[PDB]
Design an enzyme around this catalytic site. Structure first.
Site, PDB file in Angstrom:
ATOM      1  N   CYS A   1       0.572  -1.776   0.403  1.00 56.11           N
ATOM      2  CA  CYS A   1      -0.131  -0.339  -0.006  1.00 56.11           C
ATOM      3  C   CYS A   1       0.867   1.544  -0.117  1.00 56.11           C
ATOM      4  CB  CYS A   1      -0.894  -0.395   1.011  1.00 56.11           C
ATOM      5  SG  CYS A   1      -0.330   0.112   3.067  1.00 56.11           S
TER       6      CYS A   1
ATOM      7  N   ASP B   1      -8.758   4.105  -4.007  1.00 60.00           N
ATOM      8  CA  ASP B   1      -7.797   3.201  -2.785  1.00 60.00           C
ATOM      9  C   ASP B   1      -6.790   2.311  -3.964  1.00 60.00           C
ATOM     10  OD1 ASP B   1      -7.657   1.529  -1.290  1.00 60.00           O
ATOM     11  OD2 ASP B   1      -9.450   0.104  -0.329  1.00 60.00           O
TER      12      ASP B   1
ATOM     13  N   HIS C   1      -3.670   1.324   6.614  1.00 61.51           N
ATOM     14  CA  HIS C   1      -4.016   1.013   5.363  1.00 61.51           C
ATOM     15  C   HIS C   1      -3.774   2.617   4.686  1.00 61.51           C
ATOM     16  CE1 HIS C   1      -5.059   0.282   1.177  1.00 61.51           C
ATOM     17  NE2 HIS C   1      -6.533   0.458   1.422  1.00 61.51           N
TER      18      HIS C   1
END
Length: 284
Positions: A79, A131, A116
């Site tokens: 991430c 995302d 995240h």
């Protein structure tokens, strides 16, 4: 004249090289149609893996190291590497954006830490969740609304605002239950819009890459998503997912893992890292 912060290090990015890699062409103006093409290309082509954390308990997040690994070697990132790169692109193309942190729940009610990273883009009267570094990431930005069911090719997501954690105001992003084969939802992560910066990502990545309380620190996790398919290597277990139908799983030998990494994911390590990975795979 005093030097700026250069927060997301947009200037250090090889802009043309990144766009060619993600198969982006056309208008580069900071608009929604550009953002849609940026996210789809990024999610489909930038590889997703945590092998640096499994092999070295360390991940470089600086733009020169990240773009060299992700665009110039058969490697992927997790991430924080994805958000560093995407953040740098958004900055160079002149988008109004900010970083956020989410708590990856995967259905659990016990609150997880906010580890995240994601990005939020401001366009006219709206906000768009990008995302881009989840692995089985949405292929398109998601309109930040208080509640919605969103089709994303063969995948389906649910966005819902609420008291995600006590006294907080946030959103839950959920994935359709049973890889889209069942009614109902599986919570993926919860997030709040509190702005977060590259420095927060470095502090969070330190925990994610080396802490024993972080699942990505000790065992291989590799992911790939397509409009109508996905693969996840969970240590030595290969998961093959057919959205709307379900998944099948098979155990790989240490040698089959290296083969699958190259053939399925396009990941190949150096001679020494390959040797060290086989040791992590043959362990216990």
């Amino acid at each position: 004249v005093p030097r700026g912060s250069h927060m997301w290090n947009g200037d250090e990015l090889q802009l043309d090289e990144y766009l060619a890699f993600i198969g982006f062409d056309g208008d580069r103006s900071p608009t929604l149609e550009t953002l849609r093409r940026l996210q789809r290309g990024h999610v489909l082509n930038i590889k997703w893996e945590n092998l640096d954390a499994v092999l070295h308990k360390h991940v470089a997040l600086d733009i020169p190291a990240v773009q060299a690994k992700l665009l110039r070697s058969p490697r992927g990132g997790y991430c924080y590497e994805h958000v560093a790169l995407f953040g740098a692109v958004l900055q160079r193309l002149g988008f109004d954006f900010y970083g956020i942190q989410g708590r990856v729940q995967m259905g659990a009610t016990t609150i997880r830490p906010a580890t995240h990273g994601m990005l939020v883009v401001r366009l006219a009267a709206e906000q768009w969740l990008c995302d881009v570094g989840f692995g089985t990431s949405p292929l398109a930005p998601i309109r930040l609304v208080d509640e919605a069911v969103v089709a994303d090719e063969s995948w389906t997501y649910r966005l819902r605002r609420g008291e995600v954690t006590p006294g907080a105001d946030g959103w839950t992003l959920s994935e359709a239950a049973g890889d889209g084969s069942e009614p109902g939802w599986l919570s993926r992560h919860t997030f709040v819009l509190e702005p977060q910066y590259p420095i927060d990502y470095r502090a969070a990545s330190y925990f994610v890459a080396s802490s024993p309380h972080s699942p990505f620190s000790t065992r291989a996790f590799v992911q790939q998503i397509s409009p109508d398919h996905a693969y996840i290597l969970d240590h030595r277990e290969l998961h093959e997912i057919q959205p709307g139908v379900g998944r099948k799983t098979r155990q790989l030998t240490p040698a089959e893992v290296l083969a699958t990494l190259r053939e399925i994911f396009g990941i190949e390590l150096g001679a020494d890292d390959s040797t060290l990975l086989l040791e992590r795979l043959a362990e216990q």
